[PDB]
Amino acid sequence: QVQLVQSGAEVKKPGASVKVSCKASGYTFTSYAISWVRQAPGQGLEWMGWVSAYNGNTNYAQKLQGRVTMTTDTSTNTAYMELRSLRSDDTAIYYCAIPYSSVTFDCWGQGTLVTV
Amino acid sequence: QVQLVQSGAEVKKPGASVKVSCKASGYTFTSYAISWVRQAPGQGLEWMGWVSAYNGNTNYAQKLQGRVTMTTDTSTNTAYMELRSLRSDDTAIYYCAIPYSSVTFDCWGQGTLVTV
Amino acid sequence: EIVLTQSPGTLSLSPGERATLSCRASQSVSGTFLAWYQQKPGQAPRLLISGASSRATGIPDRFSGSGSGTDFTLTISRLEPEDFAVYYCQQYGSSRPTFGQGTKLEI
Amino acid sequence: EIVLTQSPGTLSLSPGERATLSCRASQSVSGTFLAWYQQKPGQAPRLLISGASSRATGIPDRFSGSGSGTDFTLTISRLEPEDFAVYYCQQYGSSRPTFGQGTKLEI
Amino acid sequence: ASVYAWNRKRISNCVADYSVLYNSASFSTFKCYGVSPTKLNDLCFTNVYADSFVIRGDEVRQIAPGQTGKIADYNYKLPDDFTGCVIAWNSNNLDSKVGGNYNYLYRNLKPFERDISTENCYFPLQSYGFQPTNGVGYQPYRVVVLSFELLHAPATVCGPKKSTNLVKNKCVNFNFNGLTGTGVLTESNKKFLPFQQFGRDIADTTDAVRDPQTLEILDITPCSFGGVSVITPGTNTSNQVAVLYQDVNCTEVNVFQ
Ligand SMILES: *[C@@H]1O[C@H](CO)[C@@H](O)[C@H](O)[C@H]1NC(C)=O
Ligand SMILES: *[C@@H]1O[C@H](CO)[C@@H](O)[C@H](O)[C@H]1NC(C)=O
């Protein structure tokens, strides 16, 4: 029942902004806090940050602080990841992570080819 | 009403020793423990050490250990700080400080510049 | 030892708009056992916030601090011409307290 | 942060043998904060073991891990052809969690 | 204040809403002796005294009646017959300062005493070791002791309870300045002196009290009661019964007096 469907690929010019979604369905949206972990092609996984879907608290990492913002939309049951100040090295596939009765990352969407 | 006047600025050669005083007035010198902080020009604050004014128990910093020594004269309500074997980068504005109505930061002194 | 990093060394903002400052820790620090410092040019440092949420005596309400655990944030709502100085973050949760390097606000 | 250097970056082992994977920590991490993961090429990670002792759902009985403190071990009895992928070890002790640099199982 | 010279602030002639303090989660411990923490809003008292001092979690348990130890024996001793409660909350933000508070010092003694003096060289005052870099049971805590003196004077400090009109000649469950009971309130001709508020019979039982707002003197007589006795011919004759109310006038439900 638990499914995440991420939006399509984006090709953006440097300095632009991107809003990538992943529709939540099959689980109570405001229960398990949504996460976001991306993977550079050929490298390992790197976590950006976690946003609680109930109250909206966030916690960002060093390598991307000042550039990322985390919001939730309870009404549409969609979590939006907004990224501004895009440059060339931001090219990676961005995955959203839901706990899915594990610890943190499971039931990822196919993947979003964010090529900048 | 509380005022702390420290000793004048010092200019010295590398390897020598320097002692800095700070007179206290308007409060019970024994009641509040003294604190010392160093700040190189352009760098941040670094705490130096603690010595209680009631019993004289000791807690020094590992980095500065074996070179710093504080003593206090209860009769004259004056705190001292002895520092031997100075090097070049230790040129900084030295503050004496007691916490009053605050956990820390209260009564930073006018500062004493020791130039090595 | 717990090390401190403030991401903006200098922020260039016109007076009137929104400013934010960061100062995080490496090992967890109790929220209560915290303070925040403003050191004017040529003057001794001054405690803006202590306890990571509570102002001191004589601090305007435009300032406010928040955060707990390792990541901490200082808030300035309205920038007045006299406010342009350097700000220090400090934690004293265990053993040696560690101070910040400073952040300058420019007109 | 804890630097996670998976010691066997490439292991040239043939199918059918027994595979062992190491995972060292710079600072001693709680055993109840560990999970080990496998990302099959083109397919999302799967929870193999959580809590450092207990295997999860949808995972064959051949997959089993152990270890405590800083030394963490995997024991795989028999290799299936579909099981050839890369494996990561992941700990959630203090502040930000840290992923692995990956160990590729070569033939 | 320091425990060797604790402060005693006098509370009188006011309405004390204790629901805010009882509901507040800000207290680290809230152990009450004497009165329940949730019923303190209804009772009424003569006076409240606040004993304020800083102690540590270790030995903090000694602020309880009849306790021993260096602090309980030499600084603050509570009586065995204590009618009141002690409240404590974590005070790290206010009473802890870096390095050490020598501002707070600690020195048997009679209850509620005060000895501020100084005299093989030893002197009777010692300083407290408040460290913010130490074990948690040694960090200073702010403790306020509320000692209650009951019956000592007319009651003046009590919670927010809305009053009603008074109904005469019926047994009602009344609460007059913390004195509760049941009885019929009627006028009386006992001339109380202006300063006396309530009267008691032999073996501590209230006969009259002076009401507030109208200052009349009402005698309190328990409402009529008595045993019920059954007169019966027997289950072998008839189911007819008679009821005897022993020596009371049944003006409240053939009837033979
Ligand atoms: C029944 O009542 C009669 C008289 O009323 C009496 O003599 C007899 O003892 C009674 N029987 C019993 C079992 O009580
Ligand atoms: C009980 O009977 C009547 C009923 O009111 C009353 O007047 C009378 O005085 C009462 N008896 C005594 C002995 O007081």
Q: Atom 7, ligand 2: which residue's CA is nearest? A: E249
**Distance in angstroms (rounded) separating the CA atoms of residues A74 and A72:** 6
**Residue of B20, E93, E6, E227 whose CA lies nearest to C52:** E93
Contact at 8 Å (CB) between D37 and A88?
Answer: no
Contact partners for chain A, using 3 or more CB pairs closer than 8 A, are: C, D
Burial of E108 (0-12, 13-18, 19+ CB in 10 A): exposed
Q: Of E102, E53, E94, E140, which Cα lies nearest the Cα of B31?
A: E102
- CA A62 – CA A66 distance, rounded (Å): 9
* A93 closest CA partner among A51, A42, A32, A50: A42
C-alpha span between C31 and E85 (Å, rounded)? 30
Q: Do the beta carbons of residue A19 and residue A70 sit within 8 Å?
A: no
Choosing among 3.30.420.40, 2.60.120.10, 2.60.40.10, 3.20.19.10, the CATH entry for D10-105 is: 2.60.40.10
Chain D positions in Cβ-Cβ contact with residue C70 (cut-off 8 Å): 95
Any chain C CB within 8 A of the CB of E202? no
DSSP code of E119?
-
Q: Which helix (DSSP H) or strand (DSSP E) does residue C107 occupy?
A: none
CB C36 within 8 A of CB C63: no
- In Å, what is the CA distance from B96 to each residue of B38, B49, B89, C91, D35? 9, 10, 20, 19, 50
Cβ–Cβ < 8 Å for B57, B110: no
Structure token digits, residue E174: 């009344």
Neighbours of E196 (CB within 10 A): 12
Rounded to 5 degrees, φ, ψ at E73 are: -90, -35
- φ, ψ (nearest 5 deg) of residue C26: -95, -35
Question: Cα–Cα distance between C107 and C79 in angstroms, integer?
Answer: 9
> B5-31 burial by CB neighbour count: b if 16+ within 10 A, else e?
ebbeebeeeeeeebebbbbbeebebbb
Q: Residue E95: what are its φ and ψ, rounded to 5°?
A: -100, 0
Residue closest via CA to ligand 2's atom 8 equals E249
Sequence-distant (≥ 6) Cβ neighbours of residue E209 within 8 angstroms: E176, E179, E197, E198, E199, E218, E220
Burial class (CB in 10 A: 0-12, 13-18, 19+), E218: buried
Judged on CB neighbours under 10 Å (0-12, 13-18, 19+), D28 is exposed
CB D49 within 8 A of CB D104: no
Contact E86, E50 (CB under 8 A): no
Inter-CA distances, B108 with B24, B81, B112, Å: 11, 15, 11
Start-to-end CA distance of chain D, whole Å, equals 33
Strands B112-115 and B10-11, by their bridges, are parallel
- Tell me how many domains chain B contains: 1
Record the tokens describing residue B113, joined without a space.
Answer: 């510049």
Which 3 state secondary structure label does DSSP give E7? strand
Q: DSSP 3-state assignment of D47? A: strand
Q: What CATH fold (topology level) applies to the domain C4-105?
A: Immunoglobulin-like (2.60.40)
CA atoms of D66 and D49, how far apart (whole Å):
9
Instruction: State the number of CA atoms in the 13 A half-sphere of D88 facing the CB.
Output: 21
Q: Which amino acid is at A21?
A: S
CB contact under 8 A, A65 and C22: yes
Contact E120, E95 (CB under 8 A): no
| Cα separation values, B52 from A58, B70, B74, E103, E137, Å | 42, 10, 11, 11, 21
Ligand 2 pocket residue status of E251, Cβ below 6 Å? yes
Exposure on the CB side of residue E165, measured as CA atoms within 13 A: 2
Helix (H) or strand (E) segment spanning residue E20: helix E19-23
User: Chain C residues with CB inside 8 Å of D3's CB?
Assistant: none
Radius of gyration of chain B measured on its C-alpha atoms: 14
If we measure between CA atoms, which residue out of E113, E108, E102 comes closest to residue E70?
Answer: E108
Rounded to whole angstroms, the Cα distance separating E85 from E31 reads 7
Is the separation of the CB atoms in E66 and E78 below 8 Å? yes
Q: Ligand 2 atom 6: the closest Cα is on which residue?
A: E249
DSSP class of residue A110 equals S
Cβ neighbourhood burial of E238 (10 Å; 0-12, 13-18, 19+): exposed
Whose tokens are 């809230």? That residue is E30
Q: Which two tokens stand for residue B84?
A: 């031997």
SS3 of residue D2 by DSSP:
coil
How big is chain D by its Cα radius of gyration, in Å?
Answer: 13
Distance between CA atoms of D95 and E48, rounded to whole angstroms? 48
Question: Which is it for strands D10-12 and D103-106: parallel, antiparallel or unpaired?
Answer: parallel
| E strands in E72-197 | 84-90, 105-106, 126-127, 140-149, 157-158, 171-176, 179-187
Bridge-based pairing of strands E105-106 and E29-32 is unpaired
Sheet containing C86-91: give its strands across. C10-12, C104-106, C86-91, C34-39, C45-50, C54-55
Q: Which residues pair with E143 in a beta bridge?
A: E53, E88
Those residues of chain C whose CB sits closer than 8 Å to some CB in chain E are 30, 32-33, 50-51, 54, 92, 94-95, 97
The CATH number linked to B89 is 2.60.40.10
- Of E245, E248, E249, E256, the residue with max ligand 2 atoms within 8 A of its CB, to mutate for a pocket test, comes to E249
Quote the CA–CA distance of E42 and E24 in Å, as a whole number.
18
Q: How was this structure determined?
A: cryo-EM
Least CA distance to A107: which residue of chain D? D44
| Radius of gyration, CA atoms only, chain A | 13
* Helix (H) or strand (E) run with residue E74 in it: helix E70-74
Q: For the residues of A39-104, what is the DSSP string, one character each?
A: E-TTS-EEEEEEE-SSS--EEE-GGGTTTEEEEEETTTTEEEEEE-S--GGG-EEEEEEB-TTSSS
Strands A3-6 and A34-39: unpaired
Alpha-carbon distance of E224 to E253, in angstroms, equals 12
Residue with tokens 């402060």, as numbered in its chain: E7
3 state SS of E70: helix
Looking at this protein, which amino acid is placed at residue E198? F
**Residue D82 DSSP one-character state:** G
3-state secondary structure of E245: strand
Phi, psi (rounded to 5 degrees) for D51: 80, 10
Note the resolution in Å, 1 decimal. Answer: 3.7
Using alpha carbons, select from D56, D59, D8 the residue that is nearest to residue D35. Answer: D56
Contacts of C82 (CB under 8 A, 6+ apart): none
Phi/psi for E87 (5° steps) reads -120, 140
Q: What is the rounded CA–CA span in Å between residue A7 and residue E113?
A: 76
- Whether B59 and chain E come into contact, CB under 8 Å, resolves to yes
Residues 6+ apart with CB under 8 A from B24: B4, B77, B78, B79, B98
Residues of D in contact with C69 (CB under 8 A): 95
Euclidean distance between the first and the last CA atom of chain E, given in angstroms as a whole number:
71
Q: Are E96 and E54 in contact (CB under 8 A)?
A: no
Bridge partners (DSSP) of residue E2 are none
CA triple C60-C64-C65, angle to 5 deg: 150
Question: Amino acid identity, residue A87?
Answer: R
Length of chain B: 116
**Residue spans per domain, chain D:** 10-105
CA dist list (Å): E110 to D14, E114, E143: 86, 9, 20
Amino acid residing at B41: P
Q: Counting runs of H as helices and runs of E as strands, what totals does chain D give?
A: 0, 9
E32 Cβ contact list (under 8 Å, min separation 6): E40, E85
Q: Give the separation between CA B73 and CA B57, rounded to whole angstroms.
A: 15
Residue pointed to by tokens 């870096």? E98
Structure-derived torsion over alpha carbons of residues D57, D63, D68, D69, reported in degrees to the nearest 10: -90
- Please give the residue range of the domain that contains residue B75: 3-114
Note whether C51 contacts E93, CB cutoff 8 Å. yes
Decide if C45 touches B, using CB distance below 8 A. yes
Tokens of B56: 């004289």
In the structure encoding, which two tokens stand for residue E243, read together?
A: 């009821």
- Cα of E256 to ligand 2 centre, how many Å? 12
Strands C10-12 and C104-106: parallel
Please name the amino acid found at residue B33. A
Atom of ligand 2 nearest to the CA of E257: 2
What single string gives the DSSP state of each residue in B46-97? EEEEEE-SSS--EEE-TTTTTTEE--EETTTTEEEEEEES--GGG-EEEEEE
